[PDB]
Amino acid sequence: PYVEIIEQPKQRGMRFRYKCEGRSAGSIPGERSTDTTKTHPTIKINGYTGPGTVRISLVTKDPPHRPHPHELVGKDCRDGYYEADLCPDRSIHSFQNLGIQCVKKRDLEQAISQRIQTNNNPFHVPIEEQRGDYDLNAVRLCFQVTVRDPAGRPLLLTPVLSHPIFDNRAPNTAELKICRVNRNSGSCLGGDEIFLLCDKVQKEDIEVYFTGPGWEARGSFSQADVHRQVAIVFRTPPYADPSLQAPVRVSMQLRRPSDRELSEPMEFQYLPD
Amino acid sequence: PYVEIIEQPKQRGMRFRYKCEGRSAGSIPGERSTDTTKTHPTIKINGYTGPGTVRISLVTKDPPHRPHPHELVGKDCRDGYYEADLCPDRSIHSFQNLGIQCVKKRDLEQAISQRIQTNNNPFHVPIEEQRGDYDLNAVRLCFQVTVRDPAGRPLLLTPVLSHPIFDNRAPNTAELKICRVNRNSGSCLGGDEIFLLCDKVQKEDIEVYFTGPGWEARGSFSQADVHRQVAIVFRTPPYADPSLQAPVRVSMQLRRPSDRELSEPMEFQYLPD
DNA sequence: CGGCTGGAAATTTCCAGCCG
DNA sequence: CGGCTGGAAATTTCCAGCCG
């Protein structure tokens, strides 16, 4: 029999709570889960109906897939994994109640120790490999279903892993926002210096992207002009038509190179010089 | 004889480094230091020359001078205090390799037990009156010099403290710096909105203080206008005289109410409306 | 109306670029 | 080298506006 993932966890949007951030750790939602239409990581077991159990371990994003040092927490969880006895009355299973608790880089080796002890190693990565560089900001759910064989004896199906989940409370995964701007208008020749206040960005990865219908231009600044990740001082780019004779609304917005990700558009209105 | 401080340690702009950064910290410069002519904490022993020793403990900022949890680190340091043989043919003493290593709040209790065990209590504060919170953002060096008397026996002179050395890590005890400003000129009628980029302030304890001979005025903004502690968007106050006939350069600077502290003055040049 | 939880901040580690 | 730095991560604790 074989497990299928008919609903992957939302790749970006969840934040790993340290075992200190309050009482909640979250509840990983599905790839198409909205503030109205809530979906969740669901699997389908092809070719089997009846008694069985499900275990959701966490494993490294990358190919040598060792058990991750972070923990899964919530209903039915224990020692960093989930484990609920499946339902015979259904074949499509959803989990609308699981959270990803990140551990401190300091307590990483005490995490993996517990991985060993509790026999949590979906892909039985030999001990000599428990060592290495654990990418703490990306995990993969590893659904390991157990159904019965013809003789009724428990039959462990192969492991099925999801695509990476990503900790929002991380450098590049946080959202883009333009809180304030000293000026929303300027000259079509550009050159106007603009002070834009935003949310924590990375001077190494950020852009002020200007756009209109068929037009495109970046504002000019540098890493030096990105004051405390939360303010950028740059200069507007020239407009398409330089010798304007009337205004032209275009839209200004923050753009992150790495992801091609944008912020809500702030109307900028180029004017005749 | 009696010790005096010919040169106090620079009160601000220096962050205290933790052990996780090194058993050696930058080194406290003299209050009168500048890129060109470097200065260091110096003391003068009035009425004595020849054999002697000098210990530099750290003690709390306010009156009951309990030995601080923090520790001094650098040449000739050990157990959180400096110690060294006084030059016997000189009377002015410089200390150019002194660093302040801040302990973690958690490790505070281990800190003071070390003060006890090593008998570091310049002002002999009893265990009774040692109890209390320790302001970990402000310390004071406490030079304890020992010379000999004519008969020849070691004579411990009384203790002399410096003025607080403030850890920049703390925005209320830190050095107000104005990094950038979109405009340094405006109208005598005021009203010009200004975007000023500074170092970590505290929305509810910061001010943009304008000034001139017989004139002072605050800029208008609110806590809502203090973006993520490192930017203030305010509006310039009217000048003393609205009938200017030519630029009148006053000085703009950050002021912190809690301690009436100021930042280096940025020239602002009011102009005729 | 006070107890629950983002968003702000305070606190601690780590790191790159540098300058003598 | 290495020690400085200054800046930003990593982590933890704060806090005000919810909410009921």
mmCIF file of C-alpha atoms in Angstrom, chain B residues 42-257:
data_model
loop_
_atom_site.group_PDB
_atom_site.id
_atom_site.type_symbol
_atom_site.label_atom_id
_atom_site.label_comp_id
_atom_site.label_asym_id
_atom_site.label_seq_id
_atom_site.Cartn_x
_atom_site.Cartn_y
_atom_site.Cartn_z
ATOM 1 C CA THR B 42 44.874 58.319 34.590
ATOM 2 C CA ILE B 43 45.239 59.002 38.319
ATOM 3 C CA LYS B 44 47.702 61.141 40.299
ATOM 4 C CA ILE B 45 48.963 60.221 43.774
ATOM 5 C CA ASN B 46 49.382 63.485 45.710
ATOM 6 C CA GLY B 47 52.093 63.227 48.309
ATOM 7 C CA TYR B 48 54.019 60.088 47.458
ATOM 8 C CA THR B 49 56.534 58.576 45.075
ATOM 9 C CA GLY B 50 58.267 55.233 45.079
ATOM 10 C CA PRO B 51 57.130 51.595 45.663
ATOM 11 C CA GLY B 52 53.423 50.895 45.534
ATOM 12 C CA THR B 53 50.540 48.977 43.896
ATOM 13 C CA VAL B 54 47.267 49.914 42.178
ATOM 14 C CA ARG B 55 44.052 47.807 41.973
ATOM 15 C CA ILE B 56 41.164 48.744 39.789
ATOM 16 C CA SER B 57 37.932 47.127 41.001
ATOM 17 C CA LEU B 58 34.501 47.824 39.530
ATOM 18 C CA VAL B 59 31.767 49.032 41.843
ATOM 19 C CA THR B 60 28.137 49.904 41.511
ATOM 20 C CA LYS B 61 27.080 53.355 40.211
ATOM 21 C CA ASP B 62 24.936 54.524 43.275
ATOM 22 C CA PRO B 63 26.088 55.217 46.915
ATOM 23 C CA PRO B 64 26.162 51.784 48.550
ATOM 24 C CA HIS B 65 29.205 50.827 46.584
ATOM 25 C CA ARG B 66 28.864 47.052 46.321
ATOM 26 C CA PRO B 67 31.432 45.334 44.064
ATOM 27 C CA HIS B 68 29.747 44.981 40.700
ATOM 28 C CA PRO B 69 28.926 41.579 39.104
ATOM 29 C CA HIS B 70 30.701 42.694 35.873
ATOM 30 C CA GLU B 71 34.457 42.326 35.568
ATOM 31 C CA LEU B 72 37.377 44.234 34.275
ATOM 32 C CA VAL B 73 39.432 42.402 31.694
ATOM 33 C CA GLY B 74 42.797 43.032 30.033
ATOM 34 C CA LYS B 75 46.508 43.324 30.861
ATOM 35 C CA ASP B 76 47.238 42.605 34.488
ATOM 36 C CA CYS B 77 43.578 41.728 35.194
ATOM 37 C CA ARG B 78 42.380 38.667 37.153
ATOM 38 C CA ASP B 79 39.119 37.846 38.988
ATOM 39 C CA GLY B 80 37.451 40.917 37.497
ATOM 40 C CA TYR B 81 39.904 43.532 38.728
ATOM 41 C CA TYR B 82 43.186 45.009 37.571
ATOM 42 C CA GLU B 83 46.303 44.771 39.734
ATOM 43 C CA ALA B 84 49.780 45.989 39.143
ATOM 44 C CA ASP B 85 52.954 47.426 40.610
ATOM 45 C CA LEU B 86 52.937 51.205 40.658
ATOM 46 C CA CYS B 87 55.873 52.764 38.843
ATOM 47 C CA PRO B 88 58.062 53.939 41.717
ATOM 48 C CA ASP B 89 59.590 56.892 39.867
ATOM 49 C CA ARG B 90 56.421 58.481 38.486
ATOM 50 C CA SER B 91 53.254 59.916 40.052
ATOM 51 C CA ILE B 92 50.713 60.022 37.164
ATOM 52 C CA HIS B 93 49.335 56.600 36.132
ATOM 53 C CA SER B 94 47.644 55.591 32.903
ATOM 54 C CA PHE B 95 45.673 52.404 32.329
ATOM 55 C CA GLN B 96 45.326 51.728 28.646
ATOM 56 C CA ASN B 97 44.267 48.069 28.600
ATOM 57 C CA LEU B 98 41.063 47.919 30.635
ATOM 58 C CA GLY B 99 37.901 46.287 29.349
ATOM 59 C CA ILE B 100 34.517 45.827 31.001
ATOM 60 C CA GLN B 101 33.050 42.378 30.602
ATOM 61 C CA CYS B 102 29.352 42.183 31.372
ATOM 62 C CA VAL B 103 27.905 39.077 32.968
ATOM 63 C CA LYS B 104 24.586 37.581 31.976
ATOM 64 C CA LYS B 105 21.717 38.272 34.399
ATOM 65 C CA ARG B 106 21.557 34.513 34.991
ATOM 66 C CA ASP B 107 25.232 34.365 36.000
ATOM 67 C CA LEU B 108 24.909 37.279 38.446
ATOM 68 C CA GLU B 109 24.912 35.048 41.543
ATOM 69 C CA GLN B 110 28.067 33.258 40.466
ATOM 70 C CA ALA B 111 29.595 36.702 39.837
ATOM 71 C CA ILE B 112 29.211 38.100 43.331
ATOM 72 C CA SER B 113 30.295 34.911 45.039
ATOM 73 C CA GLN B 114 33.536 35.460 43.113
ATOM 74 C CA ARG B 115 33.728 39.006 44.456
ATOM 75 C CA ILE B 116 33.400 37.614 48.006
ATOM 76 C CA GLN B 117 35.846 34.741 47.636
ATOM 77 C CA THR B 118 38.446 37.001 46.109
ATOM 78 C CA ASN B 119 37.878 39.707 48.709
ATOM 79 C CA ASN B 120 36.993 42.382 46.186
ATOM 80 C CA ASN B 121 34.930 44.933 48.096
ATOM 81 C CA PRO B 122 36.700 48.354 47.921
ATOM 82 C CA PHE B 123 34.165 49.866 50.247
ATOM 83 C CA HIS B 124 33.755 46.804 52.520
ATOM 84 C CA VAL B 125 29.965 46.570 51.984
ATOM 85 C CA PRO B 126 28.492 43.997 54.418
ATOM 86 C CA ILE B 127 26.540 41.025 53.072
ATOM 87 C CA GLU B 128 23.447 42.495 54.738
ATOM 88 C CA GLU B 129 23.561 45.710 52.691
ATOM 89 C CA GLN B 130 24.775 43.992 49.558
ATOM 90 C CA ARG B 131 21.289 42.645 48.799
ATOM 91 C CA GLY B 132 19.578 44.443 45.970
ATOM 92 C CA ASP B 133 19.308 44.633 42.218
ATOM 93 C CA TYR B 134 22.462 45.533 40.314
ATOM 94 C CA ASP B 135 22.183 48.059 37.439
ATOM 95 C CA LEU B 136 24.156 46.089 34.904
ATOM 96 C CA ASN B 137 24.256 48.992 32.425
ATOM 97 C CA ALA B 138 26.361 51.406 34.539
ATOM 98 C CA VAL B 139 29.602 50.777 36.404
ATOM 99 C CA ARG B 140 32.411 52.935 38.012
ATOM 100 C CA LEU B 141 36.119 52.123 38.219
ATOM 101 C CA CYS B 142 37.356 52.266 41.817
ATOM 102 C CA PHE B 143 41.128 52.836 41.988
ATOM 103 C CA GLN B 144 42.547 51.491 45.191
ATOM 104 C CA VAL B 145 46.204 52.509 45.526
ATOM 105 C CA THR B 146 48.728 51.277 48.085
ATOM 106 C CA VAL B 147 51.925 53.081 48.837
ATOM 107 C CA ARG B 148 54.140 52.896 51.897
ATOM 108 C CA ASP B 149 54.685 55.301 54.773
ATOM 109 C CA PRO B 150 58.076 56.747 55.940
ATOM 110 C CA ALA B 151 58.514 54.032 58.563
ATOM 111 C CA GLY B 152 58.281 51.863 55.412
ATOM 112 C CA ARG B 153 55.089 49.837 55.846
ATOM 113 C CA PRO B 154 52.377 49.345 53.170
ATOM 114 C CA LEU B 155 49.766 52.113 53.482
ATOM 115 C CA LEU B 156 46.522 51.634 51.670
ATOM 116 C CA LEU B 157 45.239 55.030 50.578
ATOM 117 C CA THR B 158 41.467 55.573 50.573
ATOM 118 C CA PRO B 159 39.421 54.591 47.491
ATOM 119 C CA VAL B 160 38.611 56.940 44.675
ATOM 120 C CA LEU B 161 35.840 56.238 42.155
ATOM 121 C CA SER B 162 35.412 57.560 38.665
ATOM 122 C CA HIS B 163 32.077 58.719 37.317
ATOM 123 C CA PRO B 164 29.755 56.106 35.741
ATOM 124 C CA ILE B 165 30.876 54.365 32.568
ATOM 125 C CA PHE B 166 27.620 53.652 30.708
ATOM 126 C CA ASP B 167 27.106 50.579 28.521
ATOM 127 C CA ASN B 168 25.822 51.681 25.104
ATOM 128 C CA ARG B 169 23.903 48.443 24.846
ATOM 129 C CA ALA B 170 21.280 50.328 26.903
ATOM 130 C CA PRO B 171 19.415 53.080 24.961
ATOM 131 C CA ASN B 172 18.634 55.112 28.132
ATOM 132 C CA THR B 173 22.241 55.125 29.211
ATOM 133 C CA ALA B 174 23.575 55.338 25.679
ATOM 134 C CA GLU B 175 25.001 58.021 23.453
ATOM 135 C CA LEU B 176 22.478 59.877 21.345
ATOM 136 C CA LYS B 177 23.901 59.984 17.798
ATOM 137 C CA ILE B 178 22.159 61.590 14.748
ATOM 138 C CA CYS B 179 23.177 59.519 11.760
ATOM 139 C CA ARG B 180 21.181 61.150 8.973
ATOM 140 C CA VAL B 181 18.577 63.852 8.309
ATOM 141 C CA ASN B 182 16.745 64.488 5.034
ATOM 142 C CA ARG B 183 16.976 68.238 5.479
ATOM 143 C CA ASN B 184 19.263 70.498 7.480
ATOM 144 C CA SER B 185 17.511 73.706 6.376
ATOM 145 C CA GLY B 186 13.903 74.861 6.727
ATOM 146 C CA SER B 187 11.629 77.861 7.172
ATOM 147 C CA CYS B 188 11.670 80.295 10.130
ATOM 148 C CA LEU B 189 7.947 79.629 10.444
ATOM 149 C CA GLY B 190 8.786 75.987 11.095
ATOM 150 C CA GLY B 191 6.459 73.188 10.082
ATOM 151 C CA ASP B 192 8.978 71.443 7.804
ATOM 152 C CA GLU B 193 8.736 67.702 8.364
ATOM 153 C CA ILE B 194 12.095 66.084 9.013
ATOM 154 C CA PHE B 195 13.196 62.432 8.852
ATOM 155 C CA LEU B 196 16.048 61.896 11.235
ATOM 156 C CA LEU B 197 17.866 58.597 11.565
ATOM 157 C CA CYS B 198 19.517 57.912 14.947
ATOM 158 C CA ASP B 199 20.758 55.121 17.199
ATOM 159 C CA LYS B 200 18.381 53.068 19.351
ATOM 160 C CA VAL B 201 16.396 55.588 21.434
ATOM 161 C CA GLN B 202 13.115 54.901 23.360
ATOM 162 C CA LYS B 203 10.027 56.564 21.859
ATOM 163 C CA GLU B 204 8.869 57.619 25.319
ATOM 164 C CA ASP B 205 12.063 59.375 26.429
ATOM 165 C CA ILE B 206 13.581 61.209 23.467
ATOM 166 C CA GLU B 207 13.442 64.772 22.090
ATOM 167 C CA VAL B 208 14.687 66.811 19.158
ATOM 168 C CA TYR B 209 15.942 69.919 20.958
ATOM 169 C CA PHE B 210 16.679 73.064 18.867
ATOM 170 C CA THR B 211 18.978 75.858 20.254
ATOM 171 C CA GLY B 212 20.643 79.221 19.884
ATOM 172 C CA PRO B 213 21.832 82.041 22.223
ATOM 173 C CA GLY B 214 18.780 82.835 24.304
ATOM 174 C CA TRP B 215 16.591 80.433 22.298
ATOM 175 C CA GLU B 216 15.582 76.823 22.516
ATOM 176 C CA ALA B 217 12.653 74.904 21.035
ATOM 177 C CA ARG B 218 11.621 71.290 20.633
ATOM 178 C CA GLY B 219 10.630 69.668 17.365
ATOM 179 C CA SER B 220 7.099 68.310 17.159
ATOM 180 C CA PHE B 221 6.525 64.566 16.861
ATOM 181 C CA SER B 222 5.082 61.750 18.965
ATOM 182 C CA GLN B 223 5.832 58.254 20.159
ATOM 183 C CA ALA B 224 4.013 57.076 17.084
ATOM 184 C CA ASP B 225 6.613 58.901 14.985
ATOM 185 C CA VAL B 226 9.620 57.141 16.471
ATOM 186 C CA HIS B 227 10.071 54.270 13.984
ATOM 187 C CA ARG B 228 11.572 51.078 15.473
ATOM 188 C CA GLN B 229 13.745 53.071 17.915
ATOM 189 C CA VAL B 230 16.025 54.254 15.102
ATOM 190 C CA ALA B 231 14.204 56.983 13.237
ATOM 191 C CA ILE B 232 12.074 59.971 14.229
ATOM 192 C CA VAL B 233 9.806 61.890 11.872
ATOM 193 C CA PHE B 234 9.047 65.294 13.384
ATOM 194 C CA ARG B 235 8.308 68.864 12.353
ATOM 195 C CA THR B 236 10.675 71.789 12.991
ATOM 196 C CA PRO B 237 9.540 74.427 15.532
ATOM 197 C CA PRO B 238 9.220 78.093 14.463
ATOM 198 C CA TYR B 239 12.308 80.218 14.861
ATOM 199 C CA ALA B 240 12.559 83.000 17.464
ATOM 200 C CA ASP B 241 11.869 85.472 14.648
ATOM 201 C CA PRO B 242 9.636 84.853 11.637
ATOM 202 C CA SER B 243 10.849 87.971 9.927
ATOM 203 C CA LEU B 244 14.304 86.692 8.997
ATOM 204 C CA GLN B 245 16.303 88.596 6.422
ATOM 205 C CA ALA B 246 18.844 85.774 5.916
ATOM 206 C CA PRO B 247 19.754 82.204 7.144
ATOM 207 C CA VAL B 248 20.240 81.891 10.880
ATOM 208 C CA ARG B 249 22.055 78.682 11.698
ATOM 209 C CA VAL B 250 20.907 77.273 14.992
ATOM 210 C CA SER B 251 21.788 73.822 16.235
ATOM 211 C CA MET B 252 19.600 70.714 16.265
ATOM 212 C CA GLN B 253 20.279 67.843 18.600
ATOM 213 C CA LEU B 254 18.755 64.833 20.314
ATOM 214 C CA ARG B 255 17.838 65.298 23.943
ATOM 215 C CA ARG B 256 16.849 62.687 26.469
ATOM 216 C CA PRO B 257 14.598 64.016 29.282
#
